[PDB]
Design a protein around this ligand. Structure first.
Ligand SMILES: CCCCCCCC/C=C\CCCCCCCC(=O)O[C@H](COC(=O)CCCCCCCCCCCCCCC)COP(=O)([O-])OCC[N+](C)(C)C
Ligand SMILES: CCCCCCCC/C=C\CCCCCCCC(=O)O[C@H](COC(=O)CCCCCCCCCCCCCCC)COP(=O)([O-])OCC[N+](C)(C)C
Ligand SMILES: CCCCCCCC/C=C\CCCCCCCC(=O)O[C@H](COC(=O)CCCCCCCCCCCCCCC)COP(=O)([O-])OCC[N+](C)(C)C
Ligand SMILES: CCCCCCCC/C=C\CCCCCCCC(=O)O[C@H](COC(=O)CCCCCCCCCCCCCCC)COP(=O)([O-])OCC[N+](C)(C)C
Ligand SMILES: CCCCCCCC/C=C\CCCCCCCC(=O)O[C@H](COC(=O)CCCCCCCCCCCCCCC)COP(=O)(O)OC[C@H](O)CO
Ligand SMILES: CCCCCCCC/C=C\CCCCCCCC(=O)O[C@H](COC(=O)CCCCCCCCCCCCCCC)COP(=O)(O)OC[C@H](O)CO
Ligand SMILES: CCCCCCCC/C=C\CCCCCCCC(=O)O[C@H](COC(=O)CCCCCCCCCCCCCCC)COP(=O)(O)OCCN
Ligand SMILES: CCCCCCCC/C=C\CCCCCCCC(=O)O[C@H](COC(=O)CCCCCCCCCCCCCCC)COP(=O)(O)OCCN
Ligand SMILES: COc1cc(CNC(=O)CCCC/C=C/C(C)C)ccc1O
Ligand SMILES: COc1cc(CNC(=O)CCCC/C=C/C(C)C)ccc1O
Lengths: 596, 289
């Protein structure tokens, strides 16, 4: 009976097995009898698995037993042995490896490790098991296996990293060991370019998902072993004393097939855990600073100058808007009017430019709706200024004078938007970052609270007035009480009230609660937030400049796309495949006195 | 054992220890008796007392207790349901954490008069945090939002029926045949109904909790305000049938209070609840000094 043998194996006794073996020979889940024996094993107390194997052999298609249910679909015995650290059991099963565990857990709570025994072992901090499996004799495990979505062993290794120092420790370690092992077994294959269905290199994924430690690893990797020197991503070009001159790979850091590591870091939607901190590695900092110094500083300054001219001409053509009658207007023969029409045309041209730029940005990036004001606070503003200018365009040919109520808005926005350009000047870029952050947090909170209070006490005071000028108004009373917050409040601004004591108690309560208590609270909270973000501001500014550089290079590929490339094409060492290692490497310097 | 705990790390150390040893000993001698439910004249379980008096370390112990010994596995308050790799799925007991005979551990922590040393810190344990967050997510978020919306409507109608108060003569007033006046009488009736509701709620609260007199403005800064708004509204009720025009000097106060009291509802939004807490604390300390 199946139940009897299940209890026997759970009983850790072979009496039932021996008793039923002669009789059996004479004669949703589907868990295997050997699987049941292994499962109910303590200190290796399960020995019926070997007997089951011998009986099955004496009587291939069964050593490959697997689940049938969708909950544990495909759970593999070798996988279970790996979960148990089973050297004896796993070695027996393999001797007696590409199993696909495509179930729910392998795809609420669960564990993702890949779908292959080799991947599971690598995801369990067990190195002897992986050595044996990948180089097992009966059937060695192939390292280049790619699962359904394409996550290979390295892909899962990265996918399980969690940035914690020990986790970084052994993820980096085992990544290195598996890499060098695959290199020794296959000097011909290059594993890194292996990409999943999304087509992400392990570097690209370790950077996009946000795993920083593995990133610093992959960009700072070097090997001296003569046979596999050709896995290194760093080299030390020379050294006389404490001075060292070293290289870096830039394999596809700067420009890569579809998205390089930089292009992924910058345009990451900030759903990524930590992108601002991530440009602290050495090659990236050096690279971005080099690009800024060489050939994009001039472009950014020129862009800033052109925007200054556009604001100036827009301002001076808005200042002298015709006032005679209604729009549109006839062009008088004077010269000043010709100048003014030139100003209007340049103005609308700039407006349409910004409008399109905004649409193109919103098509390429496709930004979300719940985090649009925390990822891109500047593209919104430029596009909004463009929208107001274009609505003015629309209503200046609709014979209507209201266009100004739009255009004015635009113009104000215009000048304010100039702060966008203070990111090329670190010491002002950090200030503009603080403005952005405070406007998003502190004005919003304090303004909900302050409007609660203002409206409360303003209806309170209007329900009392009688008008027996026109203070019987919620708008004029809303003002007369708002002025108390700019130090222009008149405690006796009306005598059309029934009760003076009540009126004065109300205004005094209002001044104490908003002017004295709240507003000073806002000052205190601004102090707190500044003292906290003094550094997040620096990181965000560096990221702002990095994005500037990327957009700058992408847009002006037309003028000289490959002219200003990072680093130079250098020959660093020999590789067995072709005995030549040419790479777009980037040289940097360094020193150290402790090492000698 | 609980009564002598003093939250100091070594004191927690040996109180927890000896509690465990005496418990397992009594279990071995008497597998039939269940000692924990033994309650004093006040009827407090050792858990309930360790929580009410404020002893946190012993609390974290009692709620995170587990035993593997086969004979006395049945003293555990925690279990580990399964584990494949670094993942573990575990349980918790909720013996009478959520709902208990007369007062559970939560019901004691929350309604503690703040004469307790540390109640705010005490909801840091694992089962309590998980439990309360789960309740918020599942089936009380909707109720709280609906309550907030109803209060918004009450303030709006109160405001718009106070705005257009009749000015012709003195109170009371005859109901003109117009439709707007019928709308306005509907507004006044809804207003006073809400007022009496808040008044009773306040009285019931003050009967159940029975709050002290020296710490009433530091334990419940919000029930006072809602009840006070109700009082002003009801005094307006009284003086609008006493042929007197002073009712407004009362009603106005109420209305202002009304809108301000809306801040009471910004505790369902962490990032504004913390701001309203700061307002409360500063008004009690710094404006006073
Ligand atoms: C293009 C430029 C237009 C930008 C501002 C010009 C607005 C004048 C239109 C108008 O009616 O204004 C009159 C005053 O305008 C003046 O008298 C000032 C003219 C001096 C400007 C010369 C520099 C051009 C070099 C570039 C007011 O009537
Ligand atoms: C001048 C009218 C509009 C130009 C403003 C503009 O595009 O901003 C300049 C670009 O302008 C140019 O680089 C085009 C310059 C060619 C025009 C020459 C013809 C003059 C006769 C500034 O560059 P920009 O990048 O627009 O920065 C503004 C903010 N965004 C668009 C980056 C978000
Ligand atoms: C119940 C609602 C009462 C709340 C405010 C209504 C006060 C009006 C009384 C009065 O004398 O005001 C007159 C103006 O009142 C108006 O002309 C505004 C009426 C529009 C309101 C319709 C929405 C109802 C849907 C719900 C002023 O005289
Ligand atoms: C509306 C008149 C008064 C309601 C205001 C009120 O009770 O606050 C609502 C409850 O209201 C209700 O949940 C009752 C809703 C039933 C009324 C339907 C009939 C309409 C026709 C808000 O809930 P609440 O808990 O009163 O919160 C306010 C402050 N305390 C009372 C929690 C301290
Ligand atoms: C507007 C200008 C605001 C200047 C901010 C002060 C500051 O400190 O910036 C430092 C400035 O950089 C430079 O040397 C290069 C300066 C080039 C100026 C920008 C060119 C375009 C100017 C627009 C037209 C205005 C002309 C008005 C004069 C007739 C370095 O800062 P940092 O190295 O990043 O630290
Ligand atoms: C008044 C609304 C004030 C909002 C504060 C901003 C904030 O940040 O709160 C976040 C908001 O939550 C939500 O998603 C649910 C939002 C549900 C809104 C409340 C429902 C009733 C509104 C009253 C009626 C006004 C309608 C006016 C429009 C015509 C989460 O915060 P968190 O997760 O706790 O951190
Ligand atoms: C805090 C945030 C809430 C922001 C929304 C406030 C908008 C109030 C609109 C307003 O002031 O309406 C004015 C006041 O109208 C009222 O009396 C409505 C009162 C309801 C207030 C609740 C909002 C219009 O004046 P009128 O004499 O009715 O014509
Ligand atoms: C959020 C801040 C909003 C600011 C916008 C203010 C302009 C809105 C004007 C709309 C109606 C209007 O013409 O204004 C007047 C007011 O009309 C109304 O009833 C609107 C009532 C809303 C008042 C709340 C605004 C106070 C904010 C101050 C800070 C028209 O009549 P009058 O000139 O008062 O006599
Ligand atoms: C545009 O990029 C940035 C801009 C700013 C400063 N700009 C603002 O704060 C916008 C102000 C909008 C108020 C305009 C109101 C009109 C209706 C009169 C800081 C950081 C940036 O990155
Ligand atoms: C109601 O619950 C809360 C309310 C608040 C804000 N409310 C207040 O500060 C009350 C203001 C009372 C002043 C009124 C004066 C009249 C006479 C005009 C903060 C936290 C809360 O928990």
């Amino acid at each position: 009976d199946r139940r009897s043998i299940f209890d026997a194996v759970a009983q850790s006794n072979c009496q039932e097995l021996e008793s039923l073996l002669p009789f059996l020979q004479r004669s949703e889940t589907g868990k295997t009898c050997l699987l049941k024996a292994m499962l109910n094993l303590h200190n290796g107390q399960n020995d019926t698995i070997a007997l089951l194997l011998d009986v099955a052999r004496k009587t291939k298609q069964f050593v490959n037993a697997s689940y049938t249910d969708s909950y544990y679909k495909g759970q593999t015995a070798l996988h279970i042995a790996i979960e148990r650290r089973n050297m004896t059991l796993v070695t027996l099963l393999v001797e007696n490896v590409q199993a696909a565990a495509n179930g729910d857990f392998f795809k609420r709570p669960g564990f993702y490790f890949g779908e292959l025994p080799l991947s599971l072992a690598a995801c369990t901090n067990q190195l002897a098991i992986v050595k044996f499996l990948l180089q097992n004799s009966w059937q060695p495990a192939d390292i280049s296996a790619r699962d359904s979505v394409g996550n290979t062993v390295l892909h899962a290794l990265v996918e399980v990293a969690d940035n914690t120092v020990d986790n970084t420790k052994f993820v980096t370690s085992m990544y290195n060991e598996i890499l060098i092992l695959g290199a020794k077994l296959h000097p011909t294959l290059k594993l890194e370019e292996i990409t999943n269905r999304k087509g992400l290199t392990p570097l690209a994924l370790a950077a996009s998902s946000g795993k920083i430690g593995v990133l610093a690893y992959i960009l700072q990797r070097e090997i001296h072993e003569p046979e596999c020197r050709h896995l290194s991503r760093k080299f030390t070009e020379w050294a006389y004393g404490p001075v060292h001159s070293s290289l870096y790979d830039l394999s596809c850091i700067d420009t890569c097939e579809k998205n390089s590591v930089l292009e992924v870091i910058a345009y990451s939607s900030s759903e990524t855990p930590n992108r601002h901190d991530m440009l602290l590695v050495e090659p990236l900092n050096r690279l971005l600073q080099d690009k800024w110094d060489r050939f994009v500083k001039r472009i950014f300054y020129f862009n800033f100058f052109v925007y200054c001219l556009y604001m100036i001409i827009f301002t001076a053509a808005a200042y002298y808007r015709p006032v005679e009658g209604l729009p549109p207007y006839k062009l008088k023969n004077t010269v000043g009017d010709y100048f003014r029409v030139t100003g209007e045309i340049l103005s609308v041209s700039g407006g349409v430019y910004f409008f399109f730029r905004g649409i193109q940005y919103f098509l390429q990036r496709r930004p979300s709706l719940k985090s649009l004001f925390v990822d891109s606070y500047s593209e919104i503003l430029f596009f909004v200024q463009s929208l107001f200018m274009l609505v003015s365009v629309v209503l200046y040919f609709s014979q209507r004078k209201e266009y100004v109520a739009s255009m004015v808005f635009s113009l104000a926005m215009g000048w304010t938007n100039m702060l966008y350009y203070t990111r090329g000047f670190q010491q002002m870029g950090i200030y503009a970052v603080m403005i952005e952050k405070m406007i998003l947090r502190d004005l919003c909170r304090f303004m909900f609270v302050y409007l609660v209070f203002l409206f409360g006490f303003s209806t309170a005071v209007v329900t009392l007035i009688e008008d027996g000028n026109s203070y019987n108004s919620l708008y004029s009373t809303c003002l007369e009480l708002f002025k108390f917050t700019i130090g222009m409040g008149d405690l006796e601004f009306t005598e059309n009230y029934d009760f003076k004591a009540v009126f004065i108690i109300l205004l005094l309560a209002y001044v104490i609660l908003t002017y004295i208590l709240l507003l000073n609270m806002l000052i205190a909270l601004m102090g707190e937030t500044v003292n906290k973000i003094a550094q997040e501001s620096k990181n965000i500014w560096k990221l702002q400049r990095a994005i500037t550089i990327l957009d700058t290079e992408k847009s002006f590929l037309k003028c000289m796309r490959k002219a200003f490339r990072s680093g130079k094409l250098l020959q660093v060492g020999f590789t067995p495949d072709g005995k030549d290692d040419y790479r777009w490497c980037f040289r940097v310097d360094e020193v150290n006195w402790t090492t000698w």
